[PDB]
Amino acid sequence: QPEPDMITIFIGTWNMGNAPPPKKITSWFLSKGQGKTRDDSADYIPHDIYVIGTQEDPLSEKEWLEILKHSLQEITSVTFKTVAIHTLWNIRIVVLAKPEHENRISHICTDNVKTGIANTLGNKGAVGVSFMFNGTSLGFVNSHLTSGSEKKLRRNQNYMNILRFLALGDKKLSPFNITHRFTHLFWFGDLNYRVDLPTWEAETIIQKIKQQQYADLLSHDQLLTERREQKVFLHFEEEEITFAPTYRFERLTRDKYAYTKQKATGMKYNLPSWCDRVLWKSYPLVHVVCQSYGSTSDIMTSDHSPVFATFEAGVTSQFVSKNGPGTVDSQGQIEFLRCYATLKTKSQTKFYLEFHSSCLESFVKSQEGENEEGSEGELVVKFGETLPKLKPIISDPEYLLDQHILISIKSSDSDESYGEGCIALRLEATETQLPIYTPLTHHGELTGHFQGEIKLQTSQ
Ligand SMILES: CN[C@@H](C)c1sc(C)nc1C
Q1: Whose C-alpha lies nearest to ligand 1, atom 7?
Q2: Which of 50, 273, 370, 419 is the most exposed place for a label (fewest CB within 10 A)?
Q3: Considering only CA atoms, which residue is closest to atom 10 of ligand 1?
Q4: Which family is this protein grouped under?
């Protein structure tokens, strides 16, 4: 049985509105309804992994697991294994996988983050799951962010608290948050960003939706606009939205948007919005292709419609040579030339680099770089030719070219990371000086850049 080099992953997000689901929810798992939908010819083909995020979920874990497993059995005739389930209040994540993957999956982690302080702590936040699939790390975040059209800044704060404090993936990657820990990171949920148009335009917006004319509405979508201004979800991708707003519907139909202010809404308008979203971030030059992104039309127990997204995701095998794991392979090396970091920091301290990768027996600390002033005020940290030679555990190019090097730039004075980034070893050539580049972030905010040249030696 050959190990896969691709899997397909189903991501679902549904705010259930504290109501039980209807008897049939198979359209969700089949990616049928509005938007970018799955071909009918694929209906019996199981995805490898199903990741289900709910919000306002009134069910016990047992009740929901029984509905999900029975649903997938009806669609695929496969009895899925439970990889993980984690619930914070009414926010839940379930990961299900095909039985053949049971032994390919390891290092399962779960965590949650509660957002807000006093007033604002009690029902919003995130749950997450990570695991290894053979040689590939996968992270999944289901978040329910602050509601309300006039709280986009709060949502962006909730996002930064979640990506700082959610403890998933390899703890040895201590300088790195979840936005660097995984080959593929999927972040979904009721993110609660709204279409930011005047209240008086409610009926105009509904008109536009009925005509399937989403362009003038998406130009005011707060997640698209906040992302464009680098206020949230920096370096994440989202597929084009081609489905109607998934909030706020009258229950038991999809023919009516319930937008008017009510005591029950805190006298807030809920203009039709794309509250329910799926985003991802994969390491550079890994295969990831969105194959569906849409909403169901036939599940109407909630004031939200379920959203689905599916992905092809590249995966690698658990590589064993005669040498590594358990030693280095002297036929392999990674060299760095003409390297410098450019930092936005106003501080003057010395910096060094840390290199972290599962291709190394452990992380590597560089010597201190030499600080200079950039021509436009920047701090430039010059490493020149001074960075160490990295010694990978396996020199075989079929392994090494699929690997990545995480970089942290740290203060000598405090050992705190000022910036994190990632370099792919999927090079155009080996034994050849080639340009490398990564933006650097800290707490998911841009803090600088790292650039230079790499020289990769493999056994070929
Ligand atoms: C360069 N990366 C592209 C896909 C992005 S991300 C984002 C928020 N806007 C754009 C144009």
Answers
A1: 228
A2: 370
A3: 228
A4: Belongs to the inositol 1,4,5-trisphosphate 5-phosphatase family.
| CA-based nearest residue to 53, from 19, 96, 109, 115 | 96
Closest C-alpha to ligand 1, atom 4: 237
Q: Are strands 49-55 and 6-15 parallel, antiparallel or unpaired?
A: parallel
Q: How many other C-beta atoms lie within 10 A of the C-beta of residue 18?
A: 13
Residue of the CA atom closest to atom 11 of ligand 1: 228
Atom in ligand 1 nearest the alpha carbon of residue 236: 6
Residues 309 and 176: their CA atoms lie apart, in Å, by: 27
CA of 196 to the centre of ligand 1 (A): 21
What's the 222 CA to ligand 1 centre distance in angstroms?
15
Expressed in angstroms and rounded, the spacing between residue 234 Cα and the centre of ligand 1 is 9
Ligand 1 is surrounded, with C-beta below 6 A, by 227-228
In degrees, rounded to 5, the angle at the alpha carbon of residue 281 between the alpha carbons of residues 403 and 290 is 105
If you take atom 2 of ligand 1, which residue's CA is the nearest one?
235
- CA-based R_g, the chain, Å: 23
| Amino acid letter for position 104 | R
Mutate to test the pocket of ligand 1, among 159, 227, 288 (most ligand atoms within 8 A of CB): 227
Resolution (angstroms) stands at 1.5
Question: Residue 215 CB: number of other CB atoms within 10 A?
Answer: 7
Residue type, 365: K
Beta strands 184-190 and 136-144, pairing class: parallel
Ligand 1 centroid, distance to 237 Cα (angstroms): 7
Q: For ligand 1, what atom is nearest to the CA of residue 230?
A: 8
Length of the chain: 460
